[PDB]
Structure formats: C-alpha cells, structure tokens
Amino acid sequence: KGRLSLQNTAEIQHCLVNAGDVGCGVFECFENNSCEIRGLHGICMTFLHNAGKFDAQGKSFIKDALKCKAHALRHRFGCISRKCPAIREMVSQLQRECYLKHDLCAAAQENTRVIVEMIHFKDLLLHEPYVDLVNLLLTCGEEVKEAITHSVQVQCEQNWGSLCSILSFCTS
C-alpha cells in the first residue's frame, strides 16, 4: 500500500483544482487516498464546527490556519515523490509550518479550555494530524500540558486502562 497509485492521482488532482481554498473542500477531496493519511478533514470540521467558543483572536487564527493549510496543500501537492512516508512528511511539514507562523501558542494561551476540550481521544489513535496538533499544542504553556494530560487520564478510564498505568509510571 506504499503508493498512491491505487486511488487515481488525477481524481485527487482534478478535485483539488476544482475546489476552493476557503472551505474544507481541499481536505474533502484529499481524504480518499491509497495511503491512510486520513484526519485533516476531521480537523477542518472540528475547527469550523466549534468556532463559536473561540474569541476573535481564535477565530482569526482558525480562518488563517485553514486558509494556509488549504493553499499550501494545493500548492505543494503538485510535484512530490509518490510514497506514503513522503506524503506523511509533506503533510506534517505543511501543518507544522502553518501552525507555527500563525501563533498557535497565542491561541492556546488565550482560550485554552475550548482548544483542550477537543482531544477526541478515540479519533487520535488513528489520525496522525490529530497527533501533530497534540504534540504542537503542549509546547506553549505548562498549565495547558497539565490540563490536557489530566483530561487524557480521565479519557483512559473512558477508553483504555493500560495507558493509565503506562503513562503514570514515569520518573519513579
């Protein structure tokens, strides 16, 4: 399954050049791929689904971050090597450099509760962009990291009991 050949490249390219960068149409076109890189569309839907709880700084960040992600994906999906590690590398690189230059740390520091009550733990174990947002989110504030780990510890009891004995078994 190491090649995106099984899903027509033209099918994902024609949809990309047909869609617009303003909405979630790019990630909607992108999700049906031969590799399993699903999860950008869910991030777009969750960010444009709970926009009411975000402040003006947060809504401006969400608008500009989804705009940059859509435009950068349509821009650098042109010429790339066709292998799933390269697709993962370009997706994670574009997502990281999109979140770092639009002040994700500022949006974490402003309204932390909305951005950390959106963990989606069950979705995380099978969506790499969710893991990307998690490992970029915690580097801003220490109380943000402690709150999101406190939420994950309850979500262990929701989902998996072994993680509560694995992750707590540190520095002892």
Partner: protein, 380 residues
Amino acid sequence: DCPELAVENASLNCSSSDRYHGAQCTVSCRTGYVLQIRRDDELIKSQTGPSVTVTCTEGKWNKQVACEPVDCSIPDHHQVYAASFSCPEGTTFGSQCSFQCRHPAQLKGNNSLLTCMEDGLWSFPEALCELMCLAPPPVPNADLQTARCRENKHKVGSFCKYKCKPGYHVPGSSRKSKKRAFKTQCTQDGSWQEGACVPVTCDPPPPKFHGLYQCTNGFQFNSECRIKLGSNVIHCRKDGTWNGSFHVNSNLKLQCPDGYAIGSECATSCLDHNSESIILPMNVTVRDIPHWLNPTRVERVVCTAGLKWYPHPALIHCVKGCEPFMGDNYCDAINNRAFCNYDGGDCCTSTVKTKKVTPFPMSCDLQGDCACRDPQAQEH
C-alpha cells in the same frame, strides 16, 4: 358470417359482398383524422400505414378500428404574443378558437380566429396583437425634451429623455455634483419604467447653531434657515449654495480639551475598542436594531451654543462593533447586517468569487443568521 361493420369518419372502400371466413375489407380514415387500433384476435401484423385491412373471423372482425380526430393542443403560448385564448368548442379538428388581446395592445388584422387545421396544429394568426406602450405619466419637476413623448403613440423600447427642472434632480448624485438627465424606456409589459426627480437638499449648517435651528422648510427646497449683520436669511437657491455660515457617560468616554468651552472635537470611543458607538436618538437601543437598519457613524460632539443639545453622549449607544473579517470569502453571522456593510458582501453568493457561501460555524443555518439579507444582491 360477420356482421356489416361501419366505422365513423372513414372511407370503407371495400367490396366484400360475401362476409364469410376471409372477408378481406380495407378501412382508410379521412383527412384530419388519425387511426386507432384496438385489436381482438391476430397472429401477424404488417405496416399498412394510414389505412388498415380488417378481416372476418368466426362471425367477428379481427380489429376494432376507430378514426378518432386529431388533437390540437390547448393554446398556451407560441401563437399570439400576450393574449388570452378562449376556445368555445374544443381542441379537435375543425374547431376554431377566438383570442382577444390584453388591455394595452391594439389589434391589426381582419381575421382573429385560430383553426385546428388538418396537420394537427393551429393555423396562422391572421391578426397579431400589436404591442404599443401608451402615453407616459407626466413626471413633475421634469422637462419633456422629446417632443413625441407628449403624445400617446410610442413604440416598445422608446427613449424619452427627461431633464429635471432646476432645484430638482434624479437621485444618484450628492450635493457636490449635479446630474439631472435620466432615461425612461417602455418595458416589454407595455408600461414605462418609473423614474422621478427629487428636490436638492439644502446644505446642512455647521454645528455651532444646530439643535436650536428653525428652518422655514427644513430639508426641502427654498428653505431659509435662521435661529431665534452676518447672514440674517440663508437663501437656498437652485444650486443649493449656502451664501453665509451661521453668525453669532458610564460606557462612552470622551475627553475634549476645551470641555465646556466650544470649538474642539472630542475623541469618541467606548471603554473597550471592540464596541462602536452610534447615534440612536429615536428610542432604539443596542439590541433593538434590525438588520436592514443603517445607522450613521458617531460624530464628534462639538459644543454648540449654550449646552450641547445634539444627541447626548447618553443617547449615543455603544453597540457591537465590526470585526476585521471583511471580504475574506467567509460569511459571518455576527456581521450579517447592514451596519458592517454585509461583511463586504461575503454572505451573498453574487459577490463571492467562488460563487458560494461558507458560514463560519458549521451549525449556522443557511436561511437564518448567516443568510444573504442584502437587497442589493442578485437575490432580488
């Protein structure tokens, strides 16, 4: 032995004298009548055409043919333009239909009957309802430059130029530039398109003697403005020229340098910069505004004669101000109002380059808060 068969509206040109087993007879319908076949008993068929052959079998005929008349359509359109069709008999062959024109359409032609001809279609209309627009309504404060427009005979799509009389103008230009020429043309319905000249509003005074002003006619024409040397009477002439200028809160905060003294503008802003102050003196609060209302921006209250009697900083209401989301192809339900310029037209499909509307929250309903409520779009 078969009975003798007679079929209506046809020609039974057959000579089966003995109607035994094999009485070969032929049936052909007349002109303007098509053939219907409701068979009884048959093995093989052949393409006879407009006629048919009917055979005797066991004392009965193998086919039950009937030459039903052709059906012209009920005339809805495509025959006479802008007319009502009243067929008194029906829509079969030989029927004739009568049509009468609408009220503003004269008729030319002697014969005004449509005949359902032998081809199954209506005949050619010998008279066509000539569409001519009538005399225009005489719009006041206008000059009838075209001499033919005072008559009643005008073709559809005529160009009558009406020039407004001095002191009046067609709307569209402000008090700086004067335009008084506009075009009114006959529509395809037959009525003239509406257009009128409004009077030129006399120029507003400086705010030094405003509030205590008593103009003779106000914002109408020839209004002399004078409060209860210099300029004792202000003549609002045809050009609207002001000959002489007038001669002698808890939330909202304004720090004027002069204060009680006159002559200085004050910085007008609320406690938080996210809110915008507007002048709402007619008992309308912050949340009581509708979306189609268009309040004005806050004017910096210069101190007039006496105490300020201009809308008080209290009458001026700090409302939910605009946010920097204008023209980014995103519709905002908060800025879906006429106060913040309808978010730059982003909430209306006719002013978006992507020809689409995307509400910022997924839940927002497309016919609710984030709907195109702008009448200046292509939705109306």
